[PDB]
Design an enzyme around this catalytic site. Structure first.
Site, PDB file in Angstrom:
ATOM      1  N   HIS A  39       0.812  -1.215   0.000  1.00 33.11           N
ATOM      2  CA  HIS A  39       0.000   0.000   0.000  1.00 33.11           C
ATOM      3  C   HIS A  39       0.844   1.263   0.000  1.00 33.11           C
ATOM      4  CE1 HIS A  39      -0.287  -0.226   4.580  1.00 33.11           C
ATOM      5  NE2 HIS A  39       0.209   0.968   4.327  1.00 33.11           N
ATOM      6  N   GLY A 141       2.604   5.387  10.602  1.00 32.30           N
ATOM      7  CA  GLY A 141       3.967   5.147  10.187  1.00 32.30           C
ATOM      8  C   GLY A 141       4.526   3.808  10.606  1.00 32.30           C
ATOM      9  N   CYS A 143       3.497   0.835   9.651  1.00 32.53           N
ATOM     10  CA  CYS A 143       3.354  -0.242   8.686  1.00 32.53           C
ATOM     11  C   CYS A 143       4.723  -0.754   8.265  1.00 32.53           C
ATOM     12  CB  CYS A 143       2.591   0.242   7.463  1.00 32.53           C
ATOM     13  SG  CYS A 143       0.854   0.370   7.824  1.00 32.53           S
TER      14      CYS A 143
END
Lengths: 297, 299
Positions: A39, A141, A143
């Site tokens: 993503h 942040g 991920c």
């Protein structure tokens, strides 16, 4: 008796920062590949229905900025496997540990190295829940932060972080990019299935409480396995399988409390509550410690 | 909110094992010095009633085995500083991080890298209780394991493990070898003071609740620090210090709620109870998260 995480150094040496467009998140650098959530290539224009195969082919290697501390790594190829983007780089990570990728089962635990902008921030233990969520501490942040266990010198990676659900729990994938649970990497509010409690873990924790001299919740009564399971299910607990009864043998032997007697105590706790008392300092029954986590302590 | 440790790698790279005779424990290798508990020089029987100056004068550099894994670091000097032994070694640790030695205050949290035979086993977050004990998972051979915080890229070492008390809690020193609390490194029955609730951390938790929009418990009124302290002690809460007021400053600024106003809110909660309500989803007030911990996890 508290949660304990694995030492995180072997994993710290693999964390990098990955930027595409205006999105920055973390990546995992193993040998000459950086793994991260795909993503990173979506934008606000397409995040409700991102056609990742179309987006990916339209990217060039130079659209990906990978930073390992002070050094930019040169991306020489890009592909994706399910929901994980794989950036091939021109340098193998010299700190790559012995590792494997595993898919964990619900009820098992792992350590999470929470990272922001490629920098390790915190380490803590999590359980894969029966509804395939985890109760993480993941902020914006985070991920690309990973979950892992360590066996001997080998790091078994089992989780990469992708998203938060409206209830505040979290969802992500294994390192092959397959989500745990029915979640999708689009920017929508996604509900999980019912949050069933990990019964064998609650029992393990009650044994831990006894080992630490807490005994107030015990009773003399007993119960058959099925009568326990009927009550467990009424309260959205997992039914206890025979394999799980077996897994609890060590703690039962150590304490001299047969598994079905501890089941009878848990049954009493579910039906009456704790009447303002605590166990191991908690006003709630805890289900994120496995029988293994307890024994090794 | 959950107990979260700092990443342990910078400390993993400093752990070694120190052996005298058959007695082995963990040490901390920074530059060319290894720090460890002085009772490494004791046999098990010596530990019942040690004369450390006499034990140490009988030791030479060549009686100390320091190993980083299977690699021996030769000892070239030794000295005792309070309850820590400092062994100068022939090799500067190439993995030495930027570091400081800090003596923490009760209520402060820190990460422990639990180690056996110089090999890290697990990491977890601990609070120093007001009676200067910690609730560790420390088994035999865990002595010399250290507690730390990490700020920027600098490791602040604050604890080194020495002993278990009859109650099952743990005691240790700072990295200058001074015990936290009224404990001595002798295998004798020693009792900790009555433990109390860490007031500053309960206040941090109430500020965290306000940050998350849960503010039913806020008092219109304020109190004095003295009035609060005299009341709080009746509920087995630690008295506040000026340093506690100061470390609540950022949360007070973030919420616009004066520390003494939050004290009056907590005082009312102690005196009246929760009356069935919850805060952050809990009927119990939490005392294991510092003001820094609340900011780290809310921001």
């Amino acid at each position: 008796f508290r949660k304990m995480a694995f030492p995180s150094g072997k994993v710290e040496g693999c964390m990098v920062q990955v930027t595409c467009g205006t999105t920055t998140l973390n990546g995992l650098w193993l040998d000459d590949v950086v793994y991260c959530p795909r993503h990173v290539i979506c934008t606000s224009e397409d995040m409700l229905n991102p056609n990742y195969e179309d987006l990916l082919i339209r990217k060039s290697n130079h659209n990906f900025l990978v930073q390992a501390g002070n050094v930019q790594l040169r991306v020489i190829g890009h592909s994706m496997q399910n929901c994980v983007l794989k950036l091939k780089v021109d340098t193998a990570n010299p700190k790559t540990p012995k590792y494997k990728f595993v898919r964990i089962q619900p009820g098992q635990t792992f350590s999470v190295l929470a990272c922001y902008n490629g920098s390790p921030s915190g380490v803590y233990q999590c359980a894969m829940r029966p509804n395939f969520t985890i109760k993480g501490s993941f902020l914006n942040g985070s991920c690309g932060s990973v979950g892992f266990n360590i066996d001997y010198d080998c790091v078994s990676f089992c989780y990469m972080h992708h998203m938060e659900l409206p209830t505040g729990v979290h969802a992500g994938t294994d390192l092959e990019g397959n989500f745990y649970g029915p979640f999708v990497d689009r920017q929508t509010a996604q509900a999980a299935g019912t949050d069933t409690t990990i019964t064998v873990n609650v029992l393990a924790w009650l044994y831990a409480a006894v080992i630490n001299g807490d005994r107030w919740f015990l009773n003399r009564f007993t119960t058959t396995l099925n009568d326990f399971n009927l009550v467990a299910m009424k309260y959205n607990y997992e039914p206890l399988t025979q394999d799980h009864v077996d897994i609890l043998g060590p703690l039962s032997a150590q304490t001299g409390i047969a598994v079905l007697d501890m089941c009878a105590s848990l049954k009493e706790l579910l039906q009456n509550g704790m009447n303002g008392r605590t166990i191991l300092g908690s006003a709630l029954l805890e289900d994120e410690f496995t029988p293994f986590d307890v024994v090794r302590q």
